[PDB]
Each structure stands twice: as C-alpha cells, then as structure tokens.
Amino acid sequence: ERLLDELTLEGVARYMQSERCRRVICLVGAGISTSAGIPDFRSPSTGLYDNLEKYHLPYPEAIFEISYFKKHPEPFFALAKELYPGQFKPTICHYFMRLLKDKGLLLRCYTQNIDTLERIAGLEQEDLVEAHGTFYTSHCVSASCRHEYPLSWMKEKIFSEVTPKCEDCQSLVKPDIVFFGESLPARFFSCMQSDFLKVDLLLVMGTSLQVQPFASLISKAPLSTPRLLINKEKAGQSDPFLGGGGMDFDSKKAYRDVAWLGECDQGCLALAELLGWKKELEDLVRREHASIDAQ
Numbered sequence: 001e002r003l004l005d006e007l008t009l010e011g012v013a014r015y016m017q018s019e020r021c022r023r024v025i026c027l028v029g030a031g032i033s034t035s036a037g038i039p040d041f042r043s044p045s046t047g048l049y050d051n052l053e054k055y056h057l058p059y060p061e062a063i064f065e066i067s068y069f070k071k072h073p074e075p076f077f078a079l080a081k082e083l084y085p086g087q088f089k090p091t092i093c094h095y096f097m098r099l100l101k102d103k104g105l106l107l108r109c110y111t112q113n114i115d116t117l118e119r120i121a122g123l124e125q126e127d128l129v130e131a132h133g134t135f136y137t138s139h140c141v142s143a144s145c146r147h148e149y150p151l152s153w154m155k156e157k158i159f160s161e162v163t164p165k166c167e168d169c170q171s172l173v174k175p176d177i178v179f180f181g182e183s184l185p186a187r188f189f190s191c192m193q194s195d196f197l198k199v200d201l202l203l204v205m206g207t208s209l210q211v212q213p214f215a216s217l218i219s220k221a222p223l224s225t226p227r228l229l230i231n232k233e234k235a236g237q238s239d240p241f242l243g244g245g246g247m248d249f250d251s252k253k254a255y256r257d258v259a260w261l262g263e264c265d266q267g268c269l270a271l272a273e274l275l276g277w278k279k280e281l282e283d284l285v286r287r288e289h290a291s292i293d294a295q
C-alpha cells in the first residue's frame with residue numbers, strides 16, 4: 001500500500017535504492033550546522049542586548065526584523081559579529097547532501113541556513129533554494145547601485161564594527177539574507193511549484209519547522225512521498241491546538257513518515273551506511289575538512 005516497506009531508516013534506504021526513488025528534496029535548517037560550530041541560538045547574548053540599549057529595540061526579537069533594521073542596522077550587525085562563525089567547515093550532513101548531488105538524486109536542497117555551508121560543501125546554485133537568503137553575497141541597498149560584495153568584504157566590516165557602506169555610493173550594504181518580515185525570493189515559490197510534483201523522498205534535517213512558509217513545504221509533498229526527518233526531536237507534526245500535511249510518524253495511520261532522532265551527522269552517517277555510501281562519505285568529509293583546514 002505504501003512506498004516504504006517499513007517506517008525506519010532501513011526502509012528509507014531500501015526505498016532510495018529502488019527504481020521508485022529518483023528525486024530527493026532536502027529541507028534543512030540550523031540543526032545541520034550546529035556540529036559545524038554554529039549554534040542554533042540566534043538571539044543576542046545578554047551582554048549584547050544590554051550593549052544595544054541605545055538603539056531602543058522595541059522588543060528583543062526586533063533585531064531580526066526588517067522594519068527595525070531599516071531604522072537601526074547596527075544591532076543586526078553587532079549580532080552578526082557575535083554570531084559570525086570562526087570557520088566554515090560543512091558537516092557530515094552537508095556532505096551527505098553533496099553525495100546525493102553526486103549520485104544524481106538531489107532535486108533540490110531548500111535551506112533556511114544563511115551560513116553558506118551548503119555552497120562550501122559543493123551544492124551549486126541550481127541545487128539550492130536559500131529560502132532565507134545567505135551571507136554568501138551582500139548588496140548595496142540602493143536600487144540605483146546594487147554593488148555586490150563577497151563575504152570576505154562583509155566579514156571585515158562586521159568584525160571591525162564598521163557599519164558596511166558601499167564603496168560606490170556609500171549606501172548600506174546588506175547581507176543577502178531574508179529578514180523576518182521580508183518576503184521570500186521568487187525562486188522559493190517557482191522551485192516549490194515545480195519540485196514538489198517530482199519529489200520521491202523528502203529528507204528534512206535539522207529544523208524545527210516553525211517558520212513559514214518554509215515549514216509548509218512538507219505539505220507540498222505528494223501523499224505517497226516518504227518523508228524522513230533526521231533531527232534531535234520530532235518536528236512538523238500537526239498542531240493539536242488548531243484542528244495541514246503534518247508529519248505522522250507514530251499513529252496507527254502512519255505510512256510514510258520516519259523520524260530518526262539524534263544528531264544530523266549521525267543520522268546521515270547511518271543512512272549513508274545503509275546505502276553503501278559510508279566510506280564515500282567519510283572520505284569526502286575527511287578530504288574536504290582537510291582542505292578547509294589547510295586554507
């Protein structure tokens with residue numbers, strides 16, 4: 001009756017190695033990068049919030065909001081400095097997605113992350129929907145100019161605590177991220193519309209599936225499409241307070257959703273192992289990590 005012969009990682013792996021499974025969509029968030037040293041905590045530290053008193057954040061979460069950024073960009077850039085990763089070394093999970101690409105299985109990775117690690121791990125623009133943008137590029141905010149700045153330039157401005165200004169026109173230079181309160185890129189919707197007609201497996205990793213419309217992507221999968229969540233905790237289930245498309249891992253009616261609870265790296269390693277890809281993944285990670293360490 002169902003595509004997965006059992007609702008387990010082993011069932012998913014067997015399905016992936018069947019003719020049924022050609023196209024995998026990954027949906028990822030911050031949990032895929034915590035083992036890269038990027039914590040899934042994005043609020044200012046207490047010290048930072050207190051340091052920002054003079055910018056009169058109307059509420060502490062205003063630092064994520066575009067309206068507030070347009071009034072005072074400095075809190076955001078101070079937060080960016082505090083949160084700036086010390087290194088950009090993608091995780092086992094990222095490289096697992098690279099293997100999906102290498103093996104012709106990756107239809108798309110929809111990421112909420114802004115840390116650029118998917119790109120470093122070798123997912124290309126075509127493979128990616130950076131649903132909430134990225135720090136990979138920044139732009140002058142003036143439509144008349146739109147000068148593009150690489151992350152190296154933005155990094156230098158962030159760490160020097162210099163509000164980044166465009167060299168051509170002295171406008172603010174904003175990382176290409178989607179602030180809270182901003183609309184998602186057209187690419188998100190265009191790709192969603194096409195990709196979810198084609199998906200054979202949804203692999204959801206490292207996200208609490210709280211932010212919309214990203215979280216609603218799970219409901220865009222065809223009813224038959226297996227959905228594997230690799231995450232520290234179950235996410236994406238229906239909200240019992242509302243009374244769609246929620247994950248059903250555990251009811252009597254469950255037929256296609258699998259939760260593997262633990263570290264994304266460990267889940268991807270376990271899945272890779274079941275697929276016969278563990279050595280390939282280990283070798284890829286080790287060489288890429290070595291290369292990044294040697295930068």
Ligand SMILES: [Zn+2]
Nearest residue numbers: 140145166169
């Ligand atoms: Zn400019």
